[PDB]
Design a protein around this ligand. Sequence first.
Ligand SMILES: Nc1ncnc2c1ncn2[C@@H]1O[C@H](COP(=O)(O)OP(=O)(O)O)[C@@H](O)[C@H]1O
Ligand SMILES: Nc1ncnc2c1ncn2[C@@H]1O[C@H](COP(=O)(O)OP(=O)(O)O)[C@@H](O)[C@H]1O
Lengths: 256, 253
Amino acid sequence: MLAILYDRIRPDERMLFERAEALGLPYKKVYVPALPMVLGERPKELEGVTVALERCVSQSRGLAAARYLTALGIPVVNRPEVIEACGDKWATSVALAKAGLPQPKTALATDREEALRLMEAFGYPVVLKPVIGXXXXXXXXXXXXXXXXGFQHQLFYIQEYVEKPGRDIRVFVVGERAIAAIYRAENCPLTEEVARLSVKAAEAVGGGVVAVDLFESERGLLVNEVNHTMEFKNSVHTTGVDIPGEILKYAWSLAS
Amino acid sequence: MLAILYDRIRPDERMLFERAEALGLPYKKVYVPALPMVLGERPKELEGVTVALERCVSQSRGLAAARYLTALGIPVVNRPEVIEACGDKWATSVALAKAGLPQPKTALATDREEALRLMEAFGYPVVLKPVIXXXXXXXXXXXXXXGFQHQLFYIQEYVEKPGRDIRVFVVGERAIAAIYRAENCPLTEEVARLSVKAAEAVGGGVVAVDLFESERGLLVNEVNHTMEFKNSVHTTGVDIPGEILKYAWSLAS
Ligand SMILES: Nc1ncnc2c1ncn2[C@@H]1O[C@H](COP(=O)(O)OP(=O)(O)O)[C@@H](O)[C@H]1O
Ligand SMILES: Nc1ncnc2c1ncn2[C@@H]1O[C@H](COP(=O)(O)OP(=O)(O)O)[C@@H](O)[C@H]1O
């Protein structure tokens, strides 16, 4: 049977429970915070589980649990590798580059002084984002100011400022299919071009269930971010697609 | 040519430079803190580099650079996957479990209350370590002490050790030396075999495997991605640096 791992119940999780009940798909709810994860001994709460859907709000918690499941030999929708490859912007941009996919000119610095040289070499304005878990720099003074105020110790994610003739698009990918999209809201009727780029980006980080955010730039479509635990409460009505049901079925088909 | 990535120069790095010079192995030093890492455009400092040895003291820095090198299509000794699989104790224990290797009974909690239940279920005394260093005597001590590593508690059983801790230096598919954490521990087929498998379990490459000689036999404790060896060279009389440089150079691409 299917196991839905969670910590805080959001409308998205609520919708997941309801669809599984209507679909007649065997499952059980598993509250992670209280789950004993001892290597070598399967917990009572996991008795009879053949596949799991990792739905925790906390990234660190969700990744730790996903890793435990792989140790118990239970398949988990969105493998550890995918979850970490997504929550780390530098990890994600590196994967898109290796896969030869289009994205904004991007760079990384490991100290404050090097960050400045790059921003200067890029030319203002420029953007700076946190590597884990959002600001346009106007000039050198603003740069210095922002830079002053685990594996993510002193890292600076620098990106070019993109001019956008169109609105940002968000595509919901399930396995090898793009099933819905929106303008970040109106429904964005999927086109073969958008669908194609989205699936490749999903594949570039390892496959699974992700939401790909794109920019409609003057250079064309560019990949911006890839999320490992997509939110969709509003998107269901906006697009009219049964996002939760598609997610549950995909997961169930990997049962082992 | 080979590229040695570094930030702070320690005796270990000093020894690496010297051995490369004596071996007649083409290389160049690369100061990471000042290296421009822009996706899509290879830096001047990397011109002519066919393979790299990641030697930064900072983990976050070393891992970020190793990733960049994979994007430029340059092989790096100790791939990103190995580096992170090593610097994360929960990640490393999970990998040893999947490979069916012996280790101390281990568990992980995601909140303070669950940590206590486990310590209690394990029985005192118990050990607690940072995921990325303290023995708990009883419940009172437990209560007192209590990015992707937010609020995680690594709990391990207290192991009785009739022997001394051993450290093995693994290069590829070979265990080349060992020591008692110091005397030289003449490698035995048993120790060498367990060490190579642990190295393979996290992805392979160049690592140091620390073992416990417990009452249940040999148990794997930790696997380090950037092994230190200045003292070990004399203690064991083995050319650790030269073995490391050759291994890397053989992966040239
Ligand atoms: N490099 C960039 N150039 C111009 N605008 C950007 C850039 N990166 C992000 N933005 C803008 O920042 C906002 C959201 O940024 P982001 O941190 O990437 O999160 P998300 O896109 O998932 O909401 C959007 O309005 C987006 O268009
Ligand atoms: N589970 C354990 N039981 C008893 N002693 C331990 C245990 N884990 C670690 N130690 C002791 O802790 C010290 C070092 O611990 P550790 O954090 O694993 O780093 P390292 O072994 O790489 O030096 C050693 O004296 C070791 O024997």
